[PDB]
Design a protein around this nucleic acid. Sequence first.
RNA 1: AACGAGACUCUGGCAUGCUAACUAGUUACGCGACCCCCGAGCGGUCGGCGUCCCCCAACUUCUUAGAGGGACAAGUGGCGUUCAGCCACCCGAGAUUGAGCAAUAACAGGUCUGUGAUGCCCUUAGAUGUCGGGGCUGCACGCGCGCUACACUGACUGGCUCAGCGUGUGCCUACCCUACGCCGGCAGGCGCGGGUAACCCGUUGAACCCCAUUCGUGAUGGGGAUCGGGGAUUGCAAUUAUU
Lengths: 141, 191, 141, 227, 104, 68
Amino acid sequence: VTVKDVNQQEFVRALAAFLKKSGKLKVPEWVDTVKLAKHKELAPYDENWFYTRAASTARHLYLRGGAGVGSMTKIYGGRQRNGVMPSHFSRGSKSVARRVLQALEGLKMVEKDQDWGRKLTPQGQRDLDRIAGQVAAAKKK
Amino acid sequence: TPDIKLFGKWSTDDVQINDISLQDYIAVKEKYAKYLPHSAGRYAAKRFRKAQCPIVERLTNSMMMHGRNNGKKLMTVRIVKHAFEIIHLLTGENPLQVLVNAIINSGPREDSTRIGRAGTVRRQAVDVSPLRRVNQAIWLLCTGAREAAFRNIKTIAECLADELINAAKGSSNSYAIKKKDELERVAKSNR
Amino acid sequence: PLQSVQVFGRKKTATAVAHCKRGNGLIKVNGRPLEMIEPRTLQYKLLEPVLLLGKERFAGVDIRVRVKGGGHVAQIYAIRQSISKALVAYYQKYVDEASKKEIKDILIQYDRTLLVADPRRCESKKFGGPGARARYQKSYR
Amino acid sequence: MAVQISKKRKFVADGIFKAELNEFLTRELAEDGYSGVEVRVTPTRTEIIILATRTQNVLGEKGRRIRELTAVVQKRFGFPEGSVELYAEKVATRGLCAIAQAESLRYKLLGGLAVRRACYGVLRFIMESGAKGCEVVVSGKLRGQRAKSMKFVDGLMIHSGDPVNYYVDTAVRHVLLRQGVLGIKVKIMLPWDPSGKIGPKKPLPDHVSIVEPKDEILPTTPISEQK
Amino acid sequence: AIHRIRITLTSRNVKSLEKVCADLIRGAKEKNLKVKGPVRMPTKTLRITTRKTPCGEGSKTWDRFQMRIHKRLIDLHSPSEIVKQITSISIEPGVEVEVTIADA
Amino acid sequence: MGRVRTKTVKKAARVIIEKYYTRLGNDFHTNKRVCEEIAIIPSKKLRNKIAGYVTHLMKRIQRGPVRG
RNA sequence: AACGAGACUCUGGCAUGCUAACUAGUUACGCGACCCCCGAGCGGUCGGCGUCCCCCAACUUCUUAGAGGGACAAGUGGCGUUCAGCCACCCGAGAUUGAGCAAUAACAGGUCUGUGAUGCCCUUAGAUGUCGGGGCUGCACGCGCGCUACACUGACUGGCUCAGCGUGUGCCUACCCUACGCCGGCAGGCGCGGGUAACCCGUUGAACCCCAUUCGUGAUGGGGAUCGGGGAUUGCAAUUAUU
């Protein structure tokens, strides 16, 4: 199936687990000291947040035409509570997303293609739709 | 059922209005049963236009109040789906008949107002419309659950389903059936 | 011979162009199932015409819809308003009057802006208020 | 010689040139019966049509003054040399030219003359020349050191709606004296409704009239007439 | 040769604009230059929202001013000579024109 | 609500019925197009009014005599 | 008879009618390429998913902006002198969508610190006309406009998913909006490229909202005032803390 058919809350939670089994993703050392965005006030509860976020990275590339380190951050950014000052939007971290996308590219599930952005490899696109049916196999769509 | 919507699971058949006075401002099943309570946003541009829209929707509207909850009608519908669910497990009825009793038991029979004489407060007893009774009864019980969950561990859903029980069977443990009888106790005095 | 008729619906600047093209079943929106359009609490609402009229009216068409504009909410009313009219137009053009006149009576009974459109949009603000009607506080001392 | 500025900024800079000129000229041609301008850029040439009632005093003997004015513009806005070309124009019907009528009243007053008789004299001219009506104000001092106002009015006037933009013109001119300043204002109403130039539109302004032709005859009786 | 030559018009007055466009579409179609119609572009709003009172005092008031520009362009493909000949003439109002060598 | 007709309507409505009595129908749309041809009304909204009053008068003129 | 009211101008709401579009789209194939059998079948094909390919294709519903039409108390039932109008209903967009413009006469209202508008008076070389430094932020107190909060209809951490009015370097005298690549926890730095703009930023991949964890009625993880140390950016200069 196409990844469109299935729920997406389910999609990531099986795709994150998939990667961590296969020895995939060489992770940065900083992963236990990282706020993760400028608009947070805390570190994540999750201890495998890197695996989770790489799932959501590869999915969006399937849909849209692909874009760089800047655009990924804009997709993830949220609201910043400035305390006594009124809240405003802001963008999160960059150097994390710059490690994510290069780590994917090491596996050749993405690659720097033309028109100013990484795009997902046919090998990558194969692997997405492969586990997309595994979701329907599991529960029952 | 295939020609008339339920509520997503709850029959609007086997639902009665047990007064002859307050029907034609309580209706829920003539064809006015729908899968969800929502509107396109027509509800009022005439005085008569208010009446037509469902009782279950009216309940959802008057549930979101006091600043932080305004403009969050979807969050509000979450509380109502749990309410009927809790009412059905807890006592076991068509959980709309609970609500219809709860509305009818909370509406006042006589009410007071003000009248100006000698620059001093005097009061006069007067009657009340059926449309007034419905509007008042929907207001009163929704204040109860809002009040209780303001420091309780209990969620508003739990509080609200409790408040419809004690209204549907009068027992004066609700904020509604108390406050109903306060008004009538005044209306006896100055009359 | 190719049969294709298009319609749209609107509510508060949310356009939803729903083409009825000959085929069988399989209504979609944006190349995704209508079963997973995302508030998934208003799921009974966009389904309402299909469920109420039966699925045997939707047995000579493939409908796909493209949308744009509005928020999460107003889009739901737009896609409902379009699919209702889409079905009608298919009967208006290839089948006789008495087929669709029947279908018109059913929908317009529980009219909820299925076959009509609100004329209500935002009013323009004027100075001395944060809203169009609401005004700043006035002090005499 | 490039590139070229944004289209938004293209109109603003034109407006600044249209406006600056229109106040430059008014401080020199005041006595010559100034009445406005109308600019036109044309292929590889500028036209600046310097409208004034008496082209005589504008021209001068051997065209000295027109030569001064062209040399000024050629240096001031940094025009490419020899592109600028001036032209003059005399207006016919001078009592619909509020700007000139107001600035003529100014020199009549500043010449040393009474106010009432001066206001009357200008009034009947702008009424005679054609006009539904007309108005004059003089606000400032006279006969002591507290101010007053003096209105002189005849005919029709409008004050409300969109017709104010078409069917009236209004001018303001300050005039000095040894004691303070006096404000002149002139407001004059344009009369055309039948046709032409066409300048202001044909419908009537304040009460919009129904233009009504008439024909009505019959003498018919049955007959056949072959052609 | 025959070059795709674009006659851009730009104005602020809808009457003055449109009739001058019509003239160029008649004269082109008359000579069978295979002229392509007007492409009307979005009219743009210059807004200025500023005080109505100098030396602010009294009830607080403002004033909305606006200017509406208009753009529209007719694409021709024909020899550049007869275009640049006929274009610059037969224009009465103050309306701008910009000829382009090629765009397509 | 409101929308009580002004004198500018009632003045010309009477005139237009007197001199073009024959042309009138009793339909809105026909009486509109006649007023458009026998006169020019410089607005569109104004035209839609003067027709409607011309229609409303023509109803009563087919009874006893009007005094205006 | 005239001015104001109304009329008028702008804006919203009704067009599968009209006008025409690679600086706007849609549909249709031609497709070839990728993808998964996911469904009939076998993987092909038929169907489904977007992107490149798109034309000398077709069209203008969607988008854009022009010319036009449409609503008038028009029709019906009540009511009114049966006049002027008012109420209900059909059709449907109901006779009020919101703004702009606005009379006579007046005020010792505000503005000489907008004005090379201006009277009179003052001052004018030991200057009320220039550089350097300080101040307009100084607090035992009184008042006004607001912002953020007092939690569970919540906060916190992840996941999903939607928009519009605009604006942008080539300008003032030195300056714009930013994609992409690389480096850093972050602020930020650095290398390249586009945009005179329905063309590039931006198919503006915004918040509340939505979905799943964690906290538990506790001045608590609610609240973020006060305050210590450290790192960056702007500028000629940042101390009384520029950000």
